[PDB]
């Protein structure tokens, strides 16, 4: 999925590592790797609809930065943002970042 | 070399350092072997107990 609108958390290219065998730490002879495959770790993006400037706005933001959004919305109250449209509203809220 | 003739160790019950490894048919002698063996640590012969290998 695309970037996080706040954190910019992108999908990363991780290497799924199918390991095997008992661990040396548990006396095992060693963690024999059976195979290594590329994959992608996707951010936990969500859609977040918010009524700002009498306008409902949706952010594809990571799960972590959800409350950061509401931080932004509350901060927008010291802004004169109406009657802008949701495009300009979203741009300006991005500017508050 | 078998499950009935198992391996085993021989520890000096003075030094407590396993100084001898050997075998026995648990069938034949199902008791702990014990032998005056030379403990290298003790630097003197001593009853060495059959400690499980």
């Amino acid at each position: 999925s695309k970037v996080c609108e706040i954190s910019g958390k992108r999908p990363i290219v991780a290497n799924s590592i199918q390991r095997r065998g008992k661990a040396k730490r548990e006396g095992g002879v060693g963690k024999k790797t059976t195979g290594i495959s590329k994959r992608r770790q996707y951010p936990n993006l969500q859609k977040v609809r918010v009524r700002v400037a009498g306008q409902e706005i949706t952010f594809r933001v990571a799960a972590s930065h959800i409350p950061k959004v509401y931080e932004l919305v509350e901060r927008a109250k010291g802004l004169k943002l109406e009657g802008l449209s949701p495009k300009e509203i979203k741009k300006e809220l991005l500017k508050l970042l | 070399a078998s499950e009935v003739r198992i391996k085993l160790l021989l520890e000096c019950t003075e030094c407590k350092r396993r100084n001898y490894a050997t075998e026995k048919n648990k069938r034949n002698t199902p008791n702990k072997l014990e032998l005056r063996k030379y403990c290298p640590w003790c630097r003197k012969h001593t009853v060495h107990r059959e400690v499980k290998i």
Binding site: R51, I66, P67, Y70, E74 | -
Partner: protein
């Protein structure tokens, strides 16, 4: 997520109180419905010096609950619809009641505060709770006709 109770709640407390509930309830129910506010330093600054304001508008909730309470307790609500001998061809919710007091009776109440758990589909008299203020049971009898 500490939130500032802006009003009394059946399982949260009352205005001025600051509880910490899971984010779903406050941020999906409370924040939208303004029943609470997050616990920012900005809020905690104006927490006091607005507690007086919060309980001020609370008392406005009370006094309005009375002055309109007896305003709309002493009457009967009528509902002309299309319905059958044991059934309604249509259906009614709190919104139709708001049209009832708005156009028919002229008095202005709130649709949301009126509790309508199921949109009515039968005829006759029913009693409704309005409760504009917590612990303010404003009964109301409604009639549905054809």
């Amino acid at each position: 997520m500490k939130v500032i109770l802006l009003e009394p709640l059946e399982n949260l407390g009352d205005v001025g109180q600051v509880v910490d509930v899971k984010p779903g309830y406050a941020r999906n129910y409370l924040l939208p419905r303004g029943l609470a506010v997050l616990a920012t330093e900005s809020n905690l600054k104006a927490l006091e010096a607005r507690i007086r304001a919060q309980a001020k508008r609370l008392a406005e909730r009370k006094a309005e609950a009375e002055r309109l309470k007896e305003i709309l307790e002493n009457l009967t609500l009528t509902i002309p619809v299309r319905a059958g001998e044991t059934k309604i061809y249509g259906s009614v919710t709190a919104k139709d009641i708001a049209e009832a007091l708005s156009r028919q009776h002229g008095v202005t109440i709130d649709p949301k505060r009126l509790a309508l758990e199921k949109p009515i589909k039968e005829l006759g008299e029913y009693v409704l709770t309005y409760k504009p203020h917590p612990e303010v049971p404003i009964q109301l009898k409604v009639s549905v006709v054809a």
